[PDB]
Amino acid sequence: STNPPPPETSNPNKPKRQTNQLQYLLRVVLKTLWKHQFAWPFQQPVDAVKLNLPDYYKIIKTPMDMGTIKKRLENNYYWNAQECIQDFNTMFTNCYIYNKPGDDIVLMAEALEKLFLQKINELPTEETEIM
Numbered sequence: 001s002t003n004p005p006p007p008e009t010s011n012p013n014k015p016k017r018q019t020n021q022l023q024y025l026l027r028v029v030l031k032t033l034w035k036h037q038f039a040w041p042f043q044q045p046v047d048a049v050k051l052n053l054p055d056y057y058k059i060i061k062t063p064m065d066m067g068t069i070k071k072r073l074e075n076n077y078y079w080n081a082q083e084c085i086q087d088f089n090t091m092f093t094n095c096y097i098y099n100k101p102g103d104d105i106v107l108m109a110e111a112l113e114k115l116f117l118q119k120i121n122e123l124p125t126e127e128t129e130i131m
Ligand SMILES: CCOC(=O)c1ccc(-c2csc3c(=O)cc(N4CCOCC4)oc23)cc1
Pocket: 040, 041, 042, 046, 047, 051, 053, 094, 095, 098, 099, 105
């Protein structure tokens, strides 16, 4: 068709780790985002073939979505919280560079992003490890 396989969520070489900030991201930030009115387009990888998105994978070199992010959180895939935050920003900016400003999907991403920036500002200022 063809869609690339979902992004990796497990790191054999890359070391596993957990912090109170990654914990807050999973148990609070992502839980709030997941039930937003506009979460559903971002809950799984973009099926660009079924959606007939021309050149989507030529233009979007790093596909990203909240289902991948959630599983990476559940797999301690991230070293720290800022790494998780980068995947969220990649998901939002993917949508902004691919679509006309002000389109429906862009409005949905913008509203999710606005909620996301609000919740990540509740993150503990100090990072502390977890077993
Ligand atoms: C089977 C039903 O699922 C959906 O309705 C669905 C799922 C994911 C997306 C989505 C996520 S990012 C993104 C993008 O960057 C651009 C497009 N477009 C643009 C051209 O109009 C059409 C959707 O869609 C998406 C959109 C709809």
